[PDB]
Symmetry: C2
Subunit: 412 residues, 2 copies
């Protein structure tokens, strides 16, 4: 019968910091992590900036010998996972290792690695492909490598649901525990899609902000002058735990995961419907899953990608789900500061939603100078808003019309 699930550990690499507290400090201070990209030449690209992870040292986590075999998205995923597990205080034993699993996902996975091996194949031939090309690039190897290093013998898998990956990964890991398949799950996602194919590929679709001359002002969710999303890199990981197992070991509990919804738009490969019908269905599934009156919702960490269509669809979804209470809750997009971490989006934003509950503060939407037509809710423009938050909701929407919603509340 269905068990309760709490958050006892979190971990992160973001464009604002190499852990949670440094990332969170940046969020509350309204700081942008967006900057011209330095790790490659982008003069031929329409977009030349993004949220890079700055000064990441993999040797805080892994031997240079193992690190060399792994795409950055895996290094980022393991870093966030290791932080989350350490932060949880949990010790892995023969008694519990079969009951601890991992679900760390990615939207695109090892694109840099596949690109670099593609260049070796084309310039030199197949004999120059790394022997580590497959284990070092494919999306499930965050879950795999993490299980090997820590001895996790529980459910071991990975989701790939584009920009919804992190939310789905956390949601379904919670279901694992809820239904007794595991007592502990490390869940979230990682992304590093800032290579030629990534920036080029989103470039070709005309999906990215081209504001190359003012990168910190590019990501401006619901601003009338927004021109697409800002591509960003990193990882979020949470330790999810059965409540009684957490109480049994005297775990510090950040919050309770009370609600998970999924829906498909069944509308368009890449465009959300203007009315946010699928987002609405998703949030309603989540609230019913949590047993909540929608008026209990205090804070929404929006998907809020800074696209023309996605942003307005979210307002429509929120107004349709919350009616008049849509004017009382606070909604913000931390993507205003971090940019869009794609598959890791839902993972870092679930962490911000939990830290919103711990600290009783709504993070800001920076750059919201001129709210667009119909965008007339509390969008926490410019500056963090201290306020009562009992219930926090985190939304993700992806290519394929794939929707995810997480519902967190304060735990006593």
């Amino acid at each position: 019968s269905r068990r309760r699930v709490v958050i006892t550990g979190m971990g992160m690499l973001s464009p604002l910091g190499l852990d949670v507290p440094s990332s969170w400090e940046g969020i509350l201070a309204g700081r942008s992590g967006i900057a011209p990209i330095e790790h490659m030449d982008l003069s031929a690209y329409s977009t030349r900036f993004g949220g890079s992870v700055k000064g990441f040292n993999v040797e805080e986590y892994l031997s240079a010998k193992e690190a060399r075999k792994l795409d950055l998205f895996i290094q980022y995923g393991l870093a966030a996972s290791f932080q989350a597990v350490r932060d949880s205080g949990l010790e892995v034993t023969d008694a519990n290792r079969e009951r601890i699993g991992v679900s760390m996902g990615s939207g695109i996975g090892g694109l840099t690695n596949i690109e670099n091996n593609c260049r070796s194949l084309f310039e030199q031939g197949p004999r120059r492909i790394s022997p580590f090309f497959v284990p070092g690039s494919i999306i499930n190897m965050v879950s795999g490598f993490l299980s090997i290093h820590l001895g996790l013998q529980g459910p071991n898998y990975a989701l790939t649901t584009a920009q919804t990956t992190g939310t789905h990964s956390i949601g379904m890991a919670a279901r694992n525990i809820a239904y007794g398949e595991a007592d502990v799950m490390v869940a979230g996602g990682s992304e590093m899609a800032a290579c030629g194919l990534g920036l080029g590929g989103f470039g070709a679709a005309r999906a990215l902000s081209t504001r190359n001359d003012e990168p910190t002002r590019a990501s401006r969710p619901w601003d009338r002058d927004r021109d697409g999303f800002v591509l960003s890199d990193g990882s979020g990981a949470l330790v999810l735990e059965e409540l009684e197992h957490a109480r049994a070991r005297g775990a510090r509990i950040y919050a309770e995961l009370v609600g998970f919804g999924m829906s498909g738009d069944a509308f368009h490969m890449t465009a959300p419907p203007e009315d946010g019908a699928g987002a609405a269905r998703c949030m309603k599934n989540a609230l019913r899953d949590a047993g909540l009156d929608p008026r209990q919702v205090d804070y929404i960490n929006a998907h809020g990608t800074s696209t023309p269509a996605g942003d307005i669809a979210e307002i429509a979804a929120v107004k349709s789900v919350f009616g008049e209470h849509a004017h009382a809750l606070s909604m913000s997009s931390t993507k205003s500061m971090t940019g869009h971490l794609l598959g890791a989006a839902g993972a870092v934003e679930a962490i911000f939603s939990v830290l919103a509950l711990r600290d009783q503060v709504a993070p800001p939407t920076i750059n919201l100078d001129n709210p667009d037509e119909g965008c007339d809710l509390d969008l926490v423009a410019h500056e963090a808003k201290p306020r009562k938050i009992d219930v926090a909701l985190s939304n993700s929407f992806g290519f394929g019309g794939t929707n995810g919603t997480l519902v967190f509340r304060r735990f006593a």
Copy 2:
């Protein structure tokens, strides 16, 4: 408690055929789908063969224009999904579309599209990259496109657990239905990594059979002369359905999905442990999930990849789980005929396990001329074996030591 889940439709592209009955007819005849790969200069590669899909006509499913936008792995996934839905006789309506979802996954995803867009990028720069590059290459687009084409608004997601993808997709889809999150799911996996990067990538790890002189003999699970797996392409899809929903509309039910087990080896990135301790825990987990005693298992569709360490671990795992019943059950590897479809392996092998129940026949392990040390189980060498089959297991054990087991039972 928990709802019962049945199989009401199946769909497939394999190296043996362009649908289930043609594929199955090959399986029961012991036919190989393995041949040298065409329209591709493999001169500089140590492997020049695999299981290609032969004669696939995407325009039976899609317009030329929509097919141009999608990697072959996505096309293959949609073919199987379309077959399975049609095979089910399901009618999607406004009254049920929110209760119908998709979980079609892949191990490796759009290598062929990545290869071709790399060519453009390296030759001509980023502005030649296709607008559809990203949505046409990411693993969740089978679920995405299928949900858009059929108006499916239920849970929409995708697994990527390497060679365990298909087994995990079907298992977690069954959970969605059992715990009332959906009445219907389309689940399985697809793969097309017979490109330079797949053959090169796996070739660089020396994972592949290099028996170029005799492609049909390359795949020889548990034979003392096996020298690694054979890379194969295709897709499996199953329509999973809650039992009462199936009975009400008068569906033809192939079999019941009674059990799903997962585990992690926590051993090595690509090598199983010698004793198959992980595959043993996963099978025990699947049998416990099904409330069945190991003694009740009649037929196992092995992982049976034709790798030295993989085959021997599966024998040890079975002997350990099954004790004095281990010789009584029949266990075959259809990979002896199909080769290894990676993330689609588990989907097509689930279908073969369901058809072994319908037809009371264990498919052969072809090329098993000289069983290896300790491979003294009933491995159904050379030819099909008619027998009693009430309960059938399908095992998948992939990179990162991620294990999956499905338990199917005859339905009357």
